[PDB]
Design an enzyme around this catalytic site. Structure first.
Site, PDB file in Angstrom:
ATOM      1  CG  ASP A 114      -0.149   0.104   8.656  1.00 28.65           C
ATOM      2  OD1 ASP A 114      -1.026   0.993   8.793  1.00 28.65           O
ATOM      3  OD2 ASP A 114       1.075   0.351   8.754  1.00 28.65           O
ATOM      4  CE  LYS A 155       0.907   1.133   4.403  1.00 24.96           C
ATOM      5  NZ  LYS A 155       1.781   2.320   4.703  1.00 24.96           N
TER       6      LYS A 155
END
Ligand SMILES: Nc1ccn([C@@H]2O[C@H](CO)[C@@H](O)[C@H]2O)c(=O)n1
Ligand SMILES: [Cl-]
Length: 269
Positions: free
Chosen positions: A131, A10
């Site tokens: 995350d 990401k």
């Protein structure tokens, strides 16, 4: 019997910090974006092991930590040998470890008759990395709380993105720990910023962890300054070290990267 699973990266398309939590963590607002940049994970039946190509010890690997917690919660023995080909560098701000954790555990849960529900799995991975829950969703999502409280969104962002990754590993902990009160913002300010980015105003991206990471690790600053020189607005993912920009990589950038030990990743969104 051996299978291959891809583990995507990401970037943060903006990150804001609202303040400290008593636990030692920080309350944040960020826009997560999954990018077509992958580790290759090979899973085979065997003794429980987690190995990488870059010498991460097994006991420190988040995947191993998650599989052991899975054994603990479930009572089931994990008889899988995991090898991870790490294309996404640790300390790059790209959530590679957290992605590895989410995808392997989602997969191993499925292979074992799904003893954990989707809420339980998300609890497990989230307790190891804030995350990680994002990677159970992928695509685009707003991360709130510590990042783990997620809202899927549709962005108007597309086209070329180039990642420039220096050799230096940025400590997410050391950067977060450098955060003074002048760095914090109200959630109202940040919420307005995020919606502009969602509507495609990439110039509205900012990230105070990048500001601090640039001064703690001078090489992140050199990459940043080099991207400006190439004529692009640079942005920072996570707490560094990755600097990204909306455009392609020139031969001059590729040469600078080869000389300096930077990794260049050309993506299309
Ligand atoms: N939302 C978040 C996420 C992470 N952190 C800090 O980063 C370290 C490694 O994740 C964590 O140990 C923690 O110090 C934080 O403060 N707030
Ligand atoms: Cl930024």
């Amino acid at each position: 019997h051996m299978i291959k699973v891809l583990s995507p990266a990401k970037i943060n398309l903006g990150l804001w910090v609202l303040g400290r939590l008593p636990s030692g963590y920080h309350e944040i607002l960020t826009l997560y974006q999954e990018i077509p940049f992958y580790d290759e994970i090979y899973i085979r039946e065997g003794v429980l092991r987690v190995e990488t190509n870059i010498g991460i010890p097994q006991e420190e690997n988040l995947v191993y930590k998650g599989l052991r917690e899975f054994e603990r919660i479930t009572g089931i023995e994990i008889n899988y040998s995991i090898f991870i080909q790490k294309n996404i560098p640790p300390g790059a701000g790209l959530g590679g470890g957290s992605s590895n954790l989410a995808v392997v555990l989602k997969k191993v849960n499925e292979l074992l008759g799904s003893p954990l529900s989707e809420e339980e799995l998300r609890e497990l991975v989230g307790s190891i990395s804030a995350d990680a829950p994002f990677f159970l969703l992928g695509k685009s999502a707003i991360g709130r709380g510590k990042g783990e409280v997620l809202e899927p969104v549709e962005t108007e962002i597309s086209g070329k993105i180039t990642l420039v990754i220096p050799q230096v590993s940025s400590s997410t902990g050391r950067v977060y720990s450098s955060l003074r009160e002048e760095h914090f913002v109200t959630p109202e300010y940040a919420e307005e910023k995020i919606q502009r980015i969602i509507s495609g105003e990439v110039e509205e991206i900012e990230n105070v962890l990048g500001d601090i990471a640039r001064e703690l690790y001078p090489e992140i600053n050199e990459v940043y300054r080099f991207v400006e020189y190439l004529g692009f607005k640079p942005f920072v993912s996570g707490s560094g070290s990755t600097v990204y920009f909306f455009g392609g990589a020139s031969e001059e950038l590729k040469k600078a990267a080869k000389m300096r030990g930077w990794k260049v990743v050309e993506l299309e969104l």
